[PDB]
């Protein structure tokens, strides 16, 4: 039990990190120190230290040789073990005077920790004059991403999350979203597992970013509504945000970050940047305070013509490492208005006279079927109008009209308006005799009483009198919330 040995583990700035936390890809150093050799010691013929480096610890031959003057460094890549042998020069010093005790020099293993949520344990062995050895104490350090970490109570999985909500805070993931509506996306910068992190300066300078890969074909950003707040409800000011249509069209700096994180957007994307890496680090990262980003995005009007699916996903890049969030999907309903020409004013009757020549002075009806708003939608109905621009040369608006439910409508109070029910009393009409047009509008009140889980569809009949012999056409435009749909 002669020279006691002692291993120490420090980060790239020499801070003792034993039993603490450090970022993935962080440089971790091993100091294999030994106590001063006593007086009466035999000449030291051999001084060997053997370190079986831990799993997932990448050895850096170059740096350790540089950081281990006085020792010949050898490495067994096969067993990931490194060996240090005191040079001839170094030994002479251990023998300069045996009658006295002499302090020693120590080797330093330099390398990086490569895995998330892993524990890296370490000890080394000292053998002197191939006669006796001492196994050293074990030291350790963990990386973020490991729940139930007895050393870092706040540690857990690194996982950003994304969620879609409507204006009233209701979660609308997977639901149908009317064209023109807004997606109030809530992104979470998952920072809690970083609490009490002891990473070095180089590591903290690899920056902090948050990316949102948004469907640029279906949505357009409303970056003016972007809002960033932390877990404590306070506004965040150190984060700037920008967007690019595609990697190539982005600042070389951004391409490099996204590249080293293994993140490759599908086209255009929104990226958030921490302006002062250090300030951000001391304020939110090592304090474990999660950030909340709200990035509203509106569904382009053309989506309502074609219909279709659009999905959203985010990423967060901490200390240069990237992590992806869950994917949120929504689909847009294809609002398809239709008009028919009928002699009856009964929702029941399916007979029409489409394409049939109508006799002079015939009182008929234009059946204006509104677009269908599918069940399980995301926002309330605030506008549902039928607009008809008839040809005054051929048709004279009679002055009468009726409106009917085309599907079973459900109210927020549970009442089910059975399909085919007259609903005229919830509408109003403003006619422009001059130009030859008419507009039937539902009362906003009534529309907002319909449950958002309910399907909705109406149709109206506008009585017309044929004042001239001939074939005339008409434009019927159905308006649903903030978008108009023709035909
Ligand atoms: O676990 C041991 C291994 O850890 C890492 O995977 C390193 O890439 C490799 O060099 C080393 O041998
Ligand atoms: O790792 C070898 C030995 O190193 C130190 O002496 C520790 O105190 C002891 O508990 C351990 O068995
Ligand atoms: O360093 C904190 C440590 O406190 C106690 O010693 C626990 O036994 C150990 O599991 C924990 O990691
Ligand atoms: O290159 C090492 C690691 O760096 C970052 O963590 C990247 O996000 C990851 O994909 C990569 O494996
Ligand atoms: O290395 C990248 C990955 O690391 C972790 O598994 C994260 O939970 C995951 O979201 C991320 O994509
Ligand atoms: Ca976490
Ligand atoms: Ca995109
Ligand atoms: Ca007209
Ligand atoms: Mg600790």
UniProtKB/Swiss-Prot annotation:
GO cellular component terms, A-Z: extracellular region
Originating species: Streptococcus mutans
Top-level lineage group: Bacteria
Residues of the full protein shown: 999 to 1485 of 1565
Physiological role: Surface protein antigen implicated in dental caries.
Keywords: Cell wall, Dental caries, Peptidoglycan-anchor, Repeat, Secreted, Signal
UniProt similarity note: Belongs to the antigen I/II family.
Name used for this protein in its record: Major cell-surface adhesin PAc
Signal is among the record's keywords: yes
Compartments where located: Secreted, Cell wall
């Amino acid at each position: 039990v002669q020279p006691q040995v002692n291993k120490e583990i420090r980060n790239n700035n020499d801070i003792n990190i034993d039993r603490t936390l450090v970022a993935k890809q962080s440089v971790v150093k091993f100091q294999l120190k030994t106590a001063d050799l006593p007086a009466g010691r035999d000449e030291t013929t051999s001084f060997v230290l053997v370190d079986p480096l831990p799993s997932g610890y990448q050895f850096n031959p170059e740096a350790t040789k540089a950081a281990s003057p006085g020792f010949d460094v050898t490495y067994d890549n096969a067993t990931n073990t490194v060996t240090f042998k005191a040079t001839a020069a170094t030994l002479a010093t251990f023998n300069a005077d045996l009658t006295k005790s002499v302090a020693t020099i120590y080797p330093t293993v330099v390398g990086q920790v490569l895995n998330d949520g892993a524990t890296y344990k370490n000890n080394f062995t000292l053998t002197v004059n191939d006669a006796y050895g001492i196994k050293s104490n074990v030291v350790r350090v963990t990386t973020p991403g490991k729940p139930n970490d007895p050393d870092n109570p706040n540690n857990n999985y690194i996982k950003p999350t994304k969620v879609n909500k409507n204006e009233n805070g209701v979660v609308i993931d997977g639901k149908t979203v009317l064209a023109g509506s807004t997606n109030y996306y809530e992104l979470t910068w998952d920072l809690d597992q970083y609490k009490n992190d002891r990473s070095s300066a180089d590591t903290i300078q690899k920056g902090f970013y948050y990316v949102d890969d948004y469907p640029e074909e279906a949505l357009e950003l409303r970056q003016d509504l972007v809002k960033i707040t932390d877990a404590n409800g306070n506004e965040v000011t150190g984060v700037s945000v920008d967007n690019y249509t595609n990697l190539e069209a982005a600042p070389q700096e951004i391409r490099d970050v996204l590249s080293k994180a293994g993140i490759r957007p599908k086209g255009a994307f929104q990226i958030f940047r921490a302006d002062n890496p250090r300030e951000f680090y001391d304020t939110y990262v090592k304090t474990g305070i999660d950030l909340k980003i709200v990035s509203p995005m509106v569904v382009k009007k053309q989506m309502g013509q074609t219909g279709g699916s659009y999905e959203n996903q985010a990423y967060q890049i901490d200390f240069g490492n990237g992590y992806a969030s869950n994917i949120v999907i929504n689909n847009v309903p294809k609002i398809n208005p239709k008009k028919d020409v009928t002699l009856t004013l009964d929702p029941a009757d399916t007979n029409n006279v489409d394409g049939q020549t109508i006799p002079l002075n015939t009182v008929f009806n234009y059946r204006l079927i509104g677009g269908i708003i599918p069940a399980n939608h995301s926002e309330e109905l605030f506008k549902y109008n039928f607009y008809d621009d008839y040809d005054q040369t051929g048709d004279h608006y009679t002055g009468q009209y009726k409106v009917f439910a085309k599907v079973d409508i459900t109210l927020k109070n549970g009442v089910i308006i059975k399909s085919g029910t007259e609903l005229t009393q919830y509408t109003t009409a403003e006619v422009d005799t001059t130009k030859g047009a008419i507009t039937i509008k539902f009362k906003e009140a009534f529309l907002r009483s319909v449950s958002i889980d309910s399907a909705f569809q109406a149709e109206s009949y506008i009585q017309m009198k044929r004042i001239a012999v001939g074939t005339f056409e008409n434009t019927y435009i159905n308006t649903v919330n903030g978008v108009t749909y023709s035909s």
